[PDB]
Amino acid sequence: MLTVDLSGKKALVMGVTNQRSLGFAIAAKLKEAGAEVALSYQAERLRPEAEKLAEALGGALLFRADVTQDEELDALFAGVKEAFGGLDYLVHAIAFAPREAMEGRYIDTRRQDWLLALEVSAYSLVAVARRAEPLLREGGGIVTLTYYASEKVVPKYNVMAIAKAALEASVRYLAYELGPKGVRVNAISAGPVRTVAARSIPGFTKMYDRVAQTAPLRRNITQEEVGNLGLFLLSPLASGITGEVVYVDAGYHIMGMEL
Amino acid sequence: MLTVDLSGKKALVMGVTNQRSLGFAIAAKLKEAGAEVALSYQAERLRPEAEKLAEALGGALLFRADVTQDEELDALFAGVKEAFGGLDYLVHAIAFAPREAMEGRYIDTRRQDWLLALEVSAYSLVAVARRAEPLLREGGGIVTLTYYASEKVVPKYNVMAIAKAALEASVRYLAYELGPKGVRVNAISAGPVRTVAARSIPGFTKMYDRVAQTAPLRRNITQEEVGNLGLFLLSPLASGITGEVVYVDAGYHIMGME
Amino acid sequence: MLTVDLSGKKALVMGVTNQRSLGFAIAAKLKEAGAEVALSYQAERLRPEAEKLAEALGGALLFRADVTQDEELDALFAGVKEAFGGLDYLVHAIAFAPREAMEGRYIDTRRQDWLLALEVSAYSLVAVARRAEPLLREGGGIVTLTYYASEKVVPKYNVMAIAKAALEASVRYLAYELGPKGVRVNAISAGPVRTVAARSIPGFTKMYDRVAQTAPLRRNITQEEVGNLGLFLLSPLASGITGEVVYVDAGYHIMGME
Amino acid sequence: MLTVDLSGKKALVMGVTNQRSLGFAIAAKLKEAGAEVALSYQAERLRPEAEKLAEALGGALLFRADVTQDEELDALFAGVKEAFGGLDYLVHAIAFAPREAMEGRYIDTRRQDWLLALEVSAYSLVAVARRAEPLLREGGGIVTLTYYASEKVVPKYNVMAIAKAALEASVRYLAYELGPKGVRVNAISAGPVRTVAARSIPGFTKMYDRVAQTAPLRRNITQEEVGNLGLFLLSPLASGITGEVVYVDAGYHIMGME
Ligand SMILES: NC(=O)c1ccc[n+]([C@@H]2O[C@H](COP(=O)([O-])OP(=O)(O)OC[C@H]3O[C@@H](n4cnc5c(N)ncnc54)[C@H](O)[C@@H]3O)[C@@H](O)[C@H]2O)c1
Ligand SMILES: NC(=O)c1ccc[n+]([C@@H]2O[C@H](COP(=O)([O-])OP(=O)(O)OC[C@H]3O[C@@H](n4cnc5c(N)ncnc54)[C@H](O)[C@@H]3O)[C@@H](O)[C@H]2O)c1
Ligand SMILES: NC(=O)c1ccc[n+]([C@@H]2O[C@H](COP(=O)([O-])OP(=O)(O)OC[C@H]3O[C@@H](n4cnc5c(N)ncnc54)[C@H](O)[C@@H]3O)[C@@H](O)[C@H]2O)c1
Ligand SMILES: NC(=O)c1ccc[n+]([C@@H]2O[C@H](COP(=O)([O-])OP(=O)(O)OC[C@H]3O[C@@H](n4cnc5c(N)ncnc54)[C@H](O)[C@@H]3O)[C@@H](O)[C@H]2O)c1
Ligand SMILES: Oc1cc(Cl)ccc1Oc1ccc(Cl)cc1Cl
Ligand SMILES: Oc1cc(Cl)ccc1Oc1ccc(Cl)cc1Cl
Ligand SMILES: Oc1cc(Cl)ccc1Oc1ccc(Cl)cc1Cl
Ligand SMILES: Oc1cc(Cl)ccc1Oc1ccc(Cl)cc1Cl
């Protein structure tokens, strides 16, 4: 038998809303593997859900941070430094684009909506990686969540496609810059999973059924499959893997035209 | 001999500073091919030189527009519409990132520097495509300029790599959205060329040397090689090509280790 | 106007069967630009129609060569050497996989069928590049044809996808090796075109109609669009471009879903 | 603590010569995790090491099979079926190119050498996948080993690069074809590790030493890092992952320059 024991390890998981959150799926596996887990949630309105998540993990520290707010980010990492001392793992599971940007055409994206989507969904990784850098121990890691539309056009995903392209390029540069400290940086490209944010993509259910039709495994992936890949990449089992975008999508993205 | 005749065609080329500007290389080829060319320049400061470029083309309309100013962009496309009635070609040859963003580590990029880089270097394609769309005729096209660092780490290119990654994904979505109206969208991935903007990349000389050492052709590309590719992509010869990032880099980007 | 003038340039186009052949489209454009074009065809049974193609091009030189027969390849380049003295352009428009391989599953491909597919569709490029190398002039080039199934799974393209992956990797290595000599090597990734070879892909008509529905341009490409890209890549207008796979597919391969 | 218990599961690992073999590292992890392992070695001359490897694992069935020999492959899988009744995991850690193909230029590769390289290094995945299919249980998988020269030119890796492009394309097609039964197919793209075979790449030590200087992690990967990725991809932890080429190279291949 192989055991993954992360006793002694400290994890901060940013971007949890409820138990369907992919950030949460990774937090669960990290806690199960023995790490101490802190969750960050976006706004006070989400505190009651974050409390339920801490409880479902059997214990987790909670912190409020909006990634557009540099003061709140400073306070987060100050709080994590005080509670943990050093940090091993950082999970970045945050994305946003304004409803109107997702519902219209990409070409019709308003300037301030476009910038907000990039700010929240891509710049935030840089914001948190910079603040995490002095805390992160040798062997530690940052993992983010991205989607195939960075490479190929998925209708209605619009500015998020572009944010994910910026997010993946960021992963490579941060991997290059944090690598000498023995800190790894990777992206999980997840296939469609029915989360809270899934409702924000028009035609998500079409995407979802389409993936299950065409993917090599002829099924959608699960939250736990994302959780397990996040666990692996953060664990010492993945000690030689950095700067990568690793797909957990039942093979969907390798497919060209079928039927 | 085969002929590329763009008589009757109207081009807008955005982002010329001087005669070494990649956008100007594409402008010169479109003009030589017989197209009528309008140029846009960033700021009143650049006007005297913009006029020298208009002159080197044997005439070109000039418009000033900073792509962070939506009203300047509105005015620019009102001006083009009045002057030309419509448009066939749009060249987007615009990028910027603060000096501090390019001198430091990517991880140390300040929020507002990061956002400005993406706004000027990527969002601008969207802002100009939207405005050009009602003017753009069937057979028409948009071409932008990118660099390999979108795909692979080129140290110190930093936030511009991320902006180019955004630019390239923008090219794909914009190709998808404009294609039904018969308008193509492509990016040219140029290798290093000594332009005014190259002086804003600290390691440029090192990059230039690596390319000459490593590239299949054992040399750097030229301004004219960029111009010729832009001409081709905008021309009817490229009528089947859209959503593409085409490399003009002497083969550099296909090389691994040597 | 710009003029592409290839007067005095010499081309060999390998893999013509009929007027729909992609190699023929590129031959016709090279001839239009003023190049002298020789053609090669595979076997005696194809000679009558090949002669008609040669006649269509002002009476082009015609050679027989099966790329599995090294002796025929030697005779081909000896004959080209005698006729032209050297060579500027080489077009490689040749693929085959046995019917058994294409109609089954990839996993069920027989050893000998798989090897023949790779030999004809991938190794042949190395075989002709090697023999062309001493004839090839500075500024010269080789262009081959591929399909996006090298990167993405297209059911029933089977071993040919794998041969095309081998082909594209071959293009990168040959570009590296011929580059010092000022010879470029590139691939054209064409979208579906209704050629005689199309009948060898089960369900091709389904594939063709799907492209029209979902490509950015909401149509298939044409044989001529392939011919124009071949011309461009071989011409000095593309002098900065080597080791590339350039897609002419109406944008199809950029679409991720639907 | 989270556990991976592969008790009850059966593995065939093909291509061990050495305790430094990447195939052996994967077998060691599979055995650690609880799996019953079978090993195939190439030739009678490797029996004694094979036996010591089987000792090192704590016991392992041994078989001899040359991947060019269909009868030896049929006997392998009949033997495996007899001993295990079914298979859960197949590791394909086999590659070969003739010395002469590796030592010069890709363009100079002789027909027989090119074919054999493709036959042993790419076709063998299909041959073994076909024979494994009826034995392979739902949740089962196949993992192979590749190298980044499939996408980027590494001089002197030559035909092996082309074989790896074929292999990775084969992984995508076999993943598609085996996916319906709940069987996954993936590739590990390893960075340089000092094995017997590494020495058959001219300049390997300098390639090895260069990675340690330029990789994001500023070191080479270890045999154990490959073994852990193999274990992960074959285990249920990777149940959502198929058709993937996963890089374990200390980030080396993300670098674009310097
Ligand atoms: N669900 C999927 O099918 C899928 C597929 C691929 C990638 N992803 C990515 O996974 C990540 C997590 O999304 P999810 O699907 O779990 O949905 P989710 O809604 O559960 O999580 C998204 C989180 O982003 C947070 N967030 C948004 N704006 C924020 C801001 N300004 N500051 C701080 N937090 C903010 C929200 O509060 C929320 O917790 C995202 O990056 C998403 O793009 C999701
Ligand atoms: N020179 C190279 O080696 C190279 C290589 C690859 C890609 N590129 C790209 O080519 C394009 C052209 O750059 P170039 O090298 O010709 O240099 P350049 O300086 O001649 O052109 C860049 C232009 O961007 C304009 N610009 C910057 N900010 C602007 C703003 N706010 N509003 C309006 N215009 C603005 C500048 O005024 C300038 O004319 C850029 O997108 C660049 O990233 C250049
Ligand atoms: N038609 C398409 O939609 C399409 C799309 C992408 C790529 N391609 C590629 O374009 C190239 C040309 O094919 P095409 O579609 O014009 O069909 P085609 O039938 O007109 O040309 C293919 C040629 O290959 C030749 N050939 C086959 N085996 C040979 C051998 N042993 N020796 C010498 N010649 C041999 C045939 O004689 C034939 O002329 C091929 O490589 C094909 O894979 C075609
Ligand atoms: N070592 C590295 O740095 C590295 C990097 C990337 C990929 N790889 C790949 O990993 C795999 C394993 O190689 P390795 O480095 O562990 O070296 P190795 O020498 O330990 O393993 C190579 C194996 O291939 C076998 N083989 C060759 N021809 C065969 C044939 N005809 N029939 C059956 N077996 C045959 C040999 O017997 C040998 O056991 C290979 O596919 C190789 O291409 C290695
Ligand atoms: O990136 C995603 C991809 C998929 Cl398939 C499903 C959900 C995703 O996540 C989001 C999508 C849109 C917005 Cl506005 C916010 C988020 Cl978190
Ligand atoms: O993108 C580029 C790539 C190269 Cl190799 C050289 C110059 C380039 O163009 C720029 C680089 C930095 C800034 Cl601030 C602005 C511009 Cl226009
Ligand atoms: O590669 C191709 C791709 C397409 Cl879409 C259409 C035709 C093609 O060409 C071939 C396909 C199969 C065989 Cl057996 C031989 C050839 Cl020339
Ligand atoms: O593919 C490889 C890549 C690397 Cl970096 C090191 C070793 C490799 O493996 C081989 C290399 C050459 C030959 Cl002839 C056979 C094998 Cl197994």
Short mmCIF file of C-alpha atoms in Angstrom, two decimals, chain A residues 67-70 73 104-112 114-116 118-119 122-123 126-127 129-131 133 149-158 161-162 165-167 169-170 172-174 176-178, chain B residues 67-70 73 104-112 114-115 118-119 122-123 126-127 129-131 133 149-158 161-162 165-167 169-170 172-174 176-178 181:
data_model
loop_
_atom_site.label_atom_id
_atom_site.label_comp_id
_atom_site.label_asym_id
_atom_site.label_seq_id
_atom_site.Cartn_x
_atom_site.Cartn_y
_atom_site.Cartn_z
CA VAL A 67 -8.73 39.38 -4.57
CA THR A 68 -9.43 42.86 -6.00
CA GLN A 69 -8.64 44.33 -2.54
CA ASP A 70 -4.94 44.59 -1.85
CA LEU A 73 -4.95 40.26 0.61
CA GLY A 104 -23.05 38.70 -25.11
CA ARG A 105 -20.32 38.32 -27.68
CA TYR A 106 -16.66 38.43 -26.77
CA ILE A 107 -16.24 41.30 -29.29
CA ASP A 108 -18.87 43.30 -27.32
CA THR A 109 -17.06 43.03 -23.97
CA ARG A 110 -17.01 46.38 -22.19
CA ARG A 111 -13.60 47.67 -21.11
CA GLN A 112 -14.30 47.64 -17.41
CA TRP A 114 -12.99 42.79 -19.52
CA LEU A 115 -10.46 44.24 -17.11
CA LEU A 116 -12.37 42.96 -14.06
CA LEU A 118 -8.71 39.45 -16.10
CA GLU A 119 -8.07 41.11 -12.75
CA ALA A 122 -5.68 35.91 -13.75
CA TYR A 123 -3.92 38.81 -11.99
CA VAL A 126 0.19 36.84 -9.26
CA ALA A 127 -1.19 38.83 -6.27
CA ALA A 129 1.82 34.10 -5.34
CA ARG A 130 3.80 37.27 -4.48
CA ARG A 131 2.33 37.35 -0.96
CA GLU A 133 6.41 33.54 -1.74
CA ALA A 149 -11.24 27.40 -23.88
CA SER A 150 -7.88 29.08 -23.23
CA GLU A 151 -6.69 27.11 -26.33
CA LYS A 152 -9.85 26.51 -28.32
CA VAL A 153 -13.00 28.51 -28.84
CA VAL A 154 -15.87 27.45 -26.55
CA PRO A 155 -18.91 29.59 -27.40
CA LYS A 156 -20.17 31.85 -24.54
CA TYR A 157 -17.11 31.34 -22.35
CA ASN A 158 -15.88 34.58 -23.94
CA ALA A 161 -11.24 32.05 -22.23
CA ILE A 162 -8.86 34.97 -22.47
CA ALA A 165 -4.96 32.00 -21.39
CA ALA A 166 -3.43 34.77 -19.21
CA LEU A 167 -3.71 32.43 -16.18
CA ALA A 169 0.97 31.84 -19.17
CA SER A 170 1.20 33.18 -15.61
CA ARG A 172 4.70 29.16 -16.55
CA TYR A 173 6.35 32.46 -15.50
CA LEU A 174 5.63 31.93 -11.79
CA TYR A 176 10.16 29.79 -13.56
CA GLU A 177 10.46 32.48 -10.80
CA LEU A 178 9.52 30.28 -7.75
CA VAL B 67 -6.44 52.87 -27.19
CA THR B 68 -7.11 53.48 -23.47
CA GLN B 69 -9.50 56.32 -24.45
CA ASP B 70 -12.83 55.03 -25.73
CA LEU B 73 -11.37 55.37 -30.52
CA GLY B 104 11.46 43.29 -12.50
CA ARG B 105 10.12 39.81 -11.92
CA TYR B 106 6.71 38.90 -13.29
CA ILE B 107 5.69 37.87 -9.77
CA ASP B 108 6.37 41.47 -8.59
CA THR B 109 4.09 43.05 -11.22
CA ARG B 110 1.93 45.77 -9.54
CA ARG B 111 -1.82 45.48 -10.05
CA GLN B 112 -2.16 48.71 -12.04
CA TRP B 114 -0.43 44.51 -14.98
CA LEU B 115 -3.89 45.83 -15.85
CA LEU B 118 -3.32 43.87 -20.67
CA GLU B 119 -5.57 46.83 -21.48
CA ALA B 122 -4.75 42.81 -25.49
CA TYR B 123 -8.07 44.56 -24.75
CA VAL B 126 -11.26 43.90 -28.88
CA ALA B 127 -12.00 47.66 -28.65
CA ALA B 129 -12.43 45.08 -33.67
CA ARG B 130 -15.85 46.03 -32.24
CA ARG B 131 -15.65 49.50 -33.78
CA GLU B 133 -16.88 45.47 -37.41
CA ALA B 149 6.66 34.11 -24.95
CA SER B 150 2.86 33.63 -24.83
CA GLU B 151 3.67 29.86 -25.12
CA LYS B 152 7.09 29.53 -23.43
CA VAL B 153 9.01 31.44 -20.81
CA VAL B 154 11.24 34.22 -22.18
CA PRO B 155 12.78 35.75 -19.05
CA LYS B 156 11.97 39.42 -18.47
CA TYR B 157 9.23 39.60 -21.20
CA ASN B 158 7.02 39.15 -18.13
CA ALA B 161 3.93 37.28 -22.39
CA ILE B 162 0.62 37.12 -20.48
CA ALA B 165 -1.43 34.93 -24.50
CA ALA B 166 -4.61 37.01 -24.00
CA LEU B 167 -4.15 38.57 -27.44
CA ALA B 169 -6.97 33.71 -27.42
CA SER B 170 -8.72 37.01 -28.45
CA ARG B 172 -9.42 32.91 -31.92
CA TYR B 173 -12.69 34.23 -30.44
CA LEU B 174 -12.73 37.22 -32.74
CA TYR B 176 -15.14 32.85 -34.60
CA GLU B 177 -17.37 35.97 -34.17
CA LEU B 178 -16.40 37.87 -37.31
CA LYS B 181 -19.55 38.25 -42.02
#
